């Protein structure tokens, strides 16, 4: 069982997450500037109060390029529930040296965005 290195973003609006070009990569003091490139993947949740199934707010998790459930997708590839972010100067190389997080070893890093970053409407961290 693998996981994202960071906590999720919650979606309250009716559109997909989209960061302006050059923003969206969470801060990680253990990574290099060459690493600040990846994708958010959407995870959906449904529960059952007696109206059968109820759709909860979808969450978005960040994975470095070349890692995670879509490790094989190249940067920019079009797929539902996958959005791409990168900081300027980051290399378009797989980040296999960072990999994914094993929850049995490390807790998730609190997702913090760089200074002056704008989240889309309805999106909130934790």
**23 neighbors 113 (Cβ within 8 angstroms):** yes
- Which of 122, 124, 120, 113 lies closest to 23, judged by CA? 113
Q: Evaluate whether 63 touches 70 at the Cβ level (below 8 Å).
A: yes
Does 45 show up as a binding residue in the annotation? Answer: yes
Q: Cβ(39)–Cβ(62) under 8 Å?
A: yes
- Residue 48 lies inside a defined structural domain of this protein: yes
Residue 24 lies in a domain: yes
Experimental technique behind these coordinates = X-ray
State the Cα–Cα distance between residues 37 and 87, nearest whole angstrom. 6
The answer on whether 46 is annotated among ligand-binding residues is no
Is 88 within the bounds of a domain?
A: yes
Tokens (6 digits) for 54: 């109820």
Q: Which residues pair with 42 in a beta bridge?
A: 60
Q: Beta partners for 10?
A: 59, 124
Give me the phi and psi of 35, to 5 degrees please. Answer: -95, -10
Residue 3 in any domain: the answer is: yes
Residue 76: CA atoms inside 13 Å, Cβ hemisphere, count?
3
Q: Is residue 69 part of a domain?
A: yes
HSE-CB at 73 with a 13 A cutoff on CA atoms is 21
Resolution number, Å: 2.3
Structural domain includes residue 29: yes
Q: Alpha-carbon distance 31 to 42, whole Å? A: 23
DSSP assignment of 95-119? -TTT--B-TTT-PPBPP-PPTT--P
Residue 48, annotated as binding a ligand: no
Contacts of 101 (CB under 8 A, 6+ apart): 2, 3, 4, 5, 108
């Amino acid at each position: 069982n693998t996981a994202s290195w960071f906590t999720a973003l919650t979606q309250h609006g009716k559109e997909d997450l989209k960061f302006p070009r050059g923003q969206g990569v969470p801060i990680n003091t253990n990574s290099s500037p060459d690493d600040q490139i990846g994708y958010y993947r959407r995870a959906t949740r449904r529960i059952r109060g007696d109206g059968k199934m109820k759709d909860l707010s979808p969450r978005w998790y960040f994975y470095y390029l070349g890692t995670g459930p879509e490790a094989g997708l190249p940067y920019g590839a079009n797929k539902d529930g996958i959005i791409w972010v990168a900081t300027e100067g980051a290399l378009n190389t797989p980040k296999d040296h960072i990999g994914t997080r094993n929850p049995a070893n490390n807790a998730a890093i609190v997702l913090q965005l760089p200074q002056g970053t704008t989240l889309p409407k309805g999106f909130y961290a934790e």
